[PDB]
Design a protein around this nucleic acid. Structure first.
Ligand SMILES: [K+]
Ligand SMILES: [K+]
Length: 871
DNA sequence: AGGGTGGGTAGGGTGGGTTTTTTT
């Protein structure tokens, strides 16, 4: 390199180094033998045969299977029964507590306004009594007017725990047990306490209603429908919302009630043709709001001397933030002392100063009155660092303080049941992410330490990468964290952002429609007889970017799920009949055909989110040791899940003590494992409803002849995805081998530490497959598994056979290639064509394989092909 | 689009080191 500047020299040696590296990887080129007398046999027959539902998802809509049919006798039974339940101590006390709520004074306006209108918006101002009292007001009103039999109410809750919890509280406030022929009940995936057939209040999640629309597009036998917590722009909540908006004309006798929370409720009101709204003031203790300047001024802190719509907005915001930065600082010198202001300009962004949180906790526990403390942090790292920072002091080491970390990965199953450790007078410091703000409630909070930021998900629409980064807390989220002071006593709130950022905060977070893929929603649109996909998405409130819809349509066209002409599904019927991701449905289809049902159902339930593992506090090395120990030599996270589920089944059949010892030993949660087992039950229910298996049992030997074989299971794993394949590269590294991965789309990627093949070196093959790509510090694959070249050769895609300066090379999707004799390559191409014919014919009309007539059963040949391989 | 057996008598603003919450 005679010339080139400094930075360019590394690009010169990087060009030569890239040349020698890529020519080395091409020099390897896997190996793919595929020799032996198999070639003799496979060719022969190759010429011969060439010349010659589930009734609404396992009755998850059992309450929907009704037709109202009111009668006066039942109305009289409800009226006299209400007169009898009036004389009851528990009922009287519950009614007094219900009188102590602000919504009780708003009973007449809500009841009358709901009865005289089809659409109604109720700005809740939580904490209030909207959710636990509006349905009781409606049902009690219908019962007290001789028309209680025709009343049938259904309310949608965004979270499962919120649905079942509100169901329990409402059932308790009526002096009744939940379900079992009583007034109030709930219904969620594979768990239901159904109420009465008439005059009943049923709580559920939105996915339950979307599951109902596949059997009743007009929602018969449903008098009143309620959408709660619509301020949280859950995707299903918006989709159902606009679907009901379209349903208003076809159903005049339907009453719809939306409930926001006194911020953008005027927007929801303006959506439904300027429908009237009703504001409930709610009840909350006073609470105080301290900001960063008030914190540093208070405790006298001395530091240690240290295309996305939101991203496009946060950039320019920073700009004007800079324009607002000096003057604000000047004003600060008119309000507070100079030291704390100098600390303010010395404060660092992109990182919440955990030392300030520690000193704050110390001052609160040492000088303020009794009460528990709740801390919000962006993620796991800050919780671990803050925990190690608090436990490093001798004052917190005593048994007079309780520190509880909260996280989805934290085994909160054992954290919900407690209170057997220490008496009162003990500080309950709960260091949590935003989970404590969304569902779990210890509810004994007096002090809230709101962290500055929170990790949020943003999907890229051009590079096809789901990203996640800690953004500034939304003003609604901060209002919730302030509302976390609860009805215990006057609390305190500590926001770790200056009063400048508080002026440049977005009113709300962006809806989930703009930050998640849209394949599931596209199939649900094309399956609910909603016509044009992009058109209905245009009807949807805040329509998504056009490029995202185009990309989702292209993706569904790649999988042969939608017609290239218009939205027509040749196989999207079977996929949409499955309540999971489309690639997961393809996975359970290929697993249902190949008679390896159970492991593919386990891997599918684990891949439809909800991974069965828990990591406690700060001991995660043992967690990775037990996980990698369960991996054995499979080099697969999914096969690790299979072995974990098998060990859990054997330990279950062994004894009850051995199950608890098993989950305790390998860091498992029997709740998640049980839920995934039920998910296997529902998957097998749908597969039997479609005709792929012979019985409901996922462990049926008719559909599990090959279930105990790693090769074909990994083959089904590669067949389920089809793309999302990554290349494994071998390097000399620091004199020793290291990991190098590529995806041909995002470029250089790496494996996330939560997997098993993080530091693995001994691989049988040089190809992996993944499901979740995430953009953080670098592109990470949260789950991956090795795949034999013969496996991906059967389900990869187009095949090209072109060689240069080497033996004949087979390329799937062009960029993956490996050398082998051509006379075998073309044979594999023809056998691939016949395989595609039999797969399509098997897809349009499914039925068991019925081995072994050998007339339409040549798949044992391919199974034997995959069973034979080499390094 | 990358390495230390390119070198550091080019430089480090060129770039090479971590786990969020949810439902069907
Ligand atoms: K260098
Ligand atoms: K260099």
């Amino acid at each position: 390199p005679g010339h080139l500047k400094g930075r360019e020299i590394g690009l010169w040696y990087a060009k030569k180094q890239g040349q020698k590296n890529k020519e080395a990887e091409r020099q390897e080129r896997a190996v793919v033998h595929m020799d032996e007398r198999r070639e003799e046999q496979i060719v022969q027959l190759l010429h011969s045969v060439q010349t010659k539902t589930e009734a609404y998802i396992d009755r998850d809509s059992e309450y929907l299977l009704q037709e109202n049919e009111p009668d006066a006798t039942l109305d009289q039974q409800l009226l006299e029964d209400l007169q009898k339940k009036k004389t009851d101590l528990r009922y009287i006390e519950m009614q007094r507590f219900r009188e102590k709520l602000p919504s009780y004074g708003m009973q007449k306006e809500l009841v009358n306004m709901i009865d005289n209108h089809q659409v109604t918006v109720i700005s809740g101002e939580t904490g209030c009594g909207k959710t636990t009292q509006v349905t009781q007001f409606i049902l009690d009103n219908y019962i007290e007017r001789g028309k209680g039999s025709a009343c049938r109410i259904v309310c949608t809750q965004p979270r499962r725990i919120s649905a079942i919890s509100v169901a329990e509280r409402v059932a308790a406030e009526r002096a009744e047990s939940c379900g079992n022929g009583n007034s109030t009940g709930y219904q969620i995936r594979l768990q239901s306490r159904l109420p009465r057939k008439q005059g009943s209040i049923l709580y559920c999640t939105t996915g339950i209603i979307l599951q109902w629309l596949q059997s009743d597009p007009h929602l018969s036998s449903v008098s009143h429908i309620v959408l709660d917590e619509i301020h949280e722009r859950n995707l299903q909540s918006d989709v159902l919302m606009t679907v009901v908006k379209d349903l208003l004309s076809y159903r005049p006798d339907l009453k719809v009630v939306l409930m926001s929370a006194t911020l953008n409720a005027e927007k929801f009101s303006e959506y439904f043709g300027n429908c009237p709204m009703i504001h409930i003031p709610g009840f909350t203790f006073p609470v105080v709001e301290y900001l960063l300047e008030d914190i540093i001024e208070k405790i006298r802190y001395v530091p240690e001397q240290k295309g996305h719509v939101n991203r496009q907005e946060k950039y320019y915001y920073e700009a004007i933030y800079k324009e607002r930065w000096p003057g604000y600082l000047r004003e600060l010198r008119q309000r507070y002392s100079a030291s704390t202001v100098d600390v303010v300009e010395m404060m660092d962004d992109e990182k919440v100063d955990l030392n300030l949180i520690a000193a704050l906790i110390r001052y609160i526990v040492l000088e303020e009155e009794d009460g528990a403390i709740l801390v919000f942090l962006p993620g796991w790292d800050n919780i671990s660092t803050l925990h190690d920072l608090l436990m490093s002091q001798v004052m917190f080491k005593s048994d007079k303080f309780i520190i509880i970390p909260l996280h989805s990965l934290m085994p909160t199953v054992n954290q919900t049941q407690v209170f057997k450790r220490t008496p009162p007078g003990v500080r309950k410091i709960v260091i949590a992410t935003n989970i404590a703000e969304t569902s779990i409630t210890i509810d004994d909070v007096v002090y809230v330490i709101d962290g500055g930021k929170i990790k949020e998900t943003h999907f890229d629409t051009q590079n096809n990468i789901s990203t996640m980064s800690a953004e500034w807390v939304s003003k609604a989220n901060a209002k919730q964290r302030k509302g976390r002071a609860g009805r215990v006593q006057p609390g305190h709130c500590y926001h770790l952002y200056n009063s400048l950022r508080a002026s440049l905060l977005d009113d709300y977070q962006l809806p989930e429609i703009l930050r998640t893929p849209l394949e599931e929603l596209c199939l649900q649109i094309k399956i609910l007889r909603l016509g044009g996909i992009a058109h209905f998405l245009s009807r949807l409130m805040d329509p998504p970017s056009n490029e995202a819809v185009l990309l989702s349509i292209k993706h569904l066209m790649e999988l042969n799920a939608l017609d290239k002409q218009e939205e027509l599904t040749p196989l999207g019927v079977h996929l949409a009949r499955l309540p999971v991701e489309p690639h997961i449905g393809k996975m359970i289809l290929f697993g249902a055909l190949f008679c390896c049902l159970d492991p593919v159902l386990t891997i599918a339930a684990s891949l439809s989110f909800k991974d069965p593992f828990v990591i406690p506090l700060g001991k995660e090395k043992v967690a990775d040791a037990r996980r990698k120990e369960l991996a054995a030599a499979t080099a697969s996270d999914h096969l690790t899940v299979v072995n974990a589920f098998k060990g859990w089944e054997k330990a279950k059949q062994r004894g009850f003590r051995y199950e608890k010892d098993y989950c305790w030993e390998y860091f498992l949660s029997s709740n998640t494992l049980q839920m995934l087992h039920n998910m296997k039950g529902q998957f097998a229910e749908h597969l039997l409803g479609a005709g792929f298996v012979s019985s409901r049992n996922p462990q049926d030997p008719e559909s599990n002849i090959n279930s105990d074989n790693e090769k074909i299971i990994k083959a089904v794993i590669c067949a389920g995805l089809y793309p999302k394949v990554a290349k494994i590269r071998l390097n000399l590294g620091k004199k020793r081998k290291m990991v190098k991965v590529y995806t041909k789309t995002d470029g250089v990627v790496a494996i996330h530490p939560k997997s098993v093949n993080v530091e693995q070196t001994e691989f049988n093959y040089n190809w992996l497959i993944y499901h979740l790509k995430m953009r953080t510090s670098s592109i990470y694959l949260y789950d991956c598994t090795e795949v034999s070249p013969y496996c991906l050769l059967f389900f990869g895609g187009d095949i090209s056979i072109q060689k240069d300066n080497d033996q004949e090379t087979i390329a799937v999707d062009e960029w993956i290639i490996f050398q082998s004799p051509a006379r075998i390559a073309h044979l594999v191409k023809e056998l691939r064509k016949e395989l595609d014919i039999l797969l399509q014919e098997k897809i349009e009309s499914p039925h068991p394989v019925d081995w072994k007539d050998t007339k339409s059963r040549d798949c044992a040949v391919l199974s034997a092909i995959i069973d034979l391989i080499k390094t």
